[PDB]
């Protein structure tokens, strides 16, 4: 029993984190394999980043040029390429602690944990969202970027994210481990709509799923909807339409506790138009999006 | 930006995990050096934990009844104790993956690091309070049991909890790594008493200084209090009374804002007569007590 926002296990992305510096700038890199990846901003100083050029900034380096420590030794580089915003650096020695893993780009409203890191070490694990809108809510400071999302299935670590930039709202923004930003961010320091955001519904649904297992019922009700009328009140309430594939994903949560999820739809409804008047659910005075319906079930049956 | 419920990075204690089977029983154990330390329930059936005589039922058992399994090898037991509510089974190898390691008892308001575990094998992370009631609001399911609680600073891990027992409320119970446990709680499938929770008044304050410092500063008003006169509300609001002890280790954060403690105790006193009015603070509905002053500004500042 209990439920919080846990997050994967940190030790096999602790053991691919690397320092990577050029030139003043210090930021954290992934070592897999020989290939060291991190942001290219790695390679301009605060002047640069009004409007840089990356293709001219990065002709001026030299393998020498990118050092790269892995704890205490120092790690030879023998290639260097970008990809997108990404920086592959050869390296001449795999990282003997590479896990199994692969590169994903996730979609919105996915969950991942992150490993805030500085100066290539480990500070502190979390887990979180990407929002509808391509913004994470991180908890980042500078020096932190060069630091990954991942998610992981047994003994392979799918790595999702890698940290970039910080818009001027406080809210963070990265890129998939090719390079290529999650929503329609570019690494300048340049002021940046991020639009507007919405409430992952299936989520609060799965999280709603989890209160009932956990034993708060105080939410559930005596009434039905639809897919169409709770989607009417998902608009007003800016939450994202529901949709056949949203409930398909629910039906393990929906057999577990017997309730239909268009009844849960019903509940979280009364929810979005009452409020929660005083009362929490699982610890919480809000609804809260950031666990899947696998989140929920993981959590929920202990997979390791 | 940003703040999230952080953990540390699990890896140095993913290293420690192993699974301890006596019997028809497995759970999980801690290998440092050459100790495995796990719950002593681990020696009992269902039956057995009615009203168990742990002396009696551990006399009955022999060194070559733990089976203790790390990943996949299999570690020789060459001794074993009680020592309160754990068992130390001394094994042929010192487990190579020991970090620099300490015992800690944690006091009531401290937080941790909880790497939940199922037979040995790590499932996740979440940071947790330790209640001012020796009860944790964890997240374990059945096999859980072993699970350790920890901080660290630099390369020192400091072990505070093991996970034992799960109490008929849901709420979570354990020991320090002495076997001592936490709160009244005896290791019986008897229903007893937690005690009157409160909220800890010196973790709420520091949340609300990370909020400021985050940008969230609706909550700040012209007024201000005295220690008396906010012991009065924390009274009424089942809050933990504030002594000068909790005013001087918020000094770094009141040095941080140039917010006046008993100023933001002022703030926090309208927070409990008025509620938020709908509105939130650093993402949550309410106020929230498992940050400590240590934890806010290392997550502020990017310790690693
Ligand atoms: O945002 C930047 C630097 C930057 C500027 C423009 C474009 C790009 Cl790609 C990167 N770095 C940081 C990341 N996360 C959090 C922060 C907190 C404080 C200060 N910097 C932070
Ligand atoms: O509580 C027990 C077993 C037990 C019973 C009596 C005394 C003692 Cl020391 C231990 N184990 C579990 C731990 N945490 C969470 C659980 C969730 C479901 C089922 N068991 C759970």
Redesign the pocket.
């Given at each position: 029993s209990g439920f919080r926002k846990m997050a994967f296990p940190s030790g096999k992305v602790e053991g691919c984190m690397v320092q990577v510096t050029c030139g003043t700038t210090t930021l954290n890199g992934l070592w897999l394999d020989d290939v060291v990846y991190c942001?290219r901003?790695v390679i301009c100083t605060s002047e640069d980043?009004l409007n840089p050029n990356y293709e001219d900034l990065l002709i001026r380096k030299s393998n020498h040029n990118f050092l790269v420590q892995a704890g205490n030794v120092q790690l030879r580089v023998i290639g260097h390429s970008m990809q997108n915003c990404v920086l592959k650096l050869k390296v001449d020695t795999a990282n003997p602690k590479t896990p199994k893993y692969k590169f994903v780009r996730i979609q919105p409203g996915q969950t991942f944990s992150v490993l805030a890191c500085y100066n290539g070490s480990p500070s502190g694990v979390y887990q979180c969202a990407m929002r509808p809108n391509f913004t994470i809510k991180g908890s980042?400071?500078?020096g932190?970027?060069g630091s990954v999302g991942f998610n992981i299935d047994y003994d392979c670590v799918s790595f999702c994210y890698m940290?970039?930039?910080?818009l001027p709202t406080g809210v963070?923004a990265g890129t998939d481990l090719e390079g290529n930003f999650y929503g329609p961010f570019v690494?300048?320091?340049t002021a940046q709509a991020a639009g507007t955001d919405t409430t992952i519904t299936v989520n609060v649904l799965a999280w709603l799923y989890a209160a009932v297992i956990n034993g708060d019922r105080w939410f559930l009700n005596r009434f039905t909807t639809t897919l169409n009328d709770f989607n009417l009140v998902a608009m007003k309430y800016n939450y994202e339409p529901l949709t056949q594939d949203h409930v398909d994903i629910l039906g393990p949560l929906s057999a577990q506790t017997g309730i239909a999820v268009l009844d849960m739809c019903a509940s979280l409804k009364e929810l979005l138009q009452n409020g929660m008047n005083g009362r929490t659910i699982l610890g919480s005075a809000l609804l809260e999006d950031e666990f899947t319906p696998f989140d929920v079930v993981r959590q929920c049956s202990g997979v390791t």
């Open positions: 942001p901003h980043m980042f400071l500078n932190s970027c940290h970039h930039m910080e963070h690494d300048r320091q």
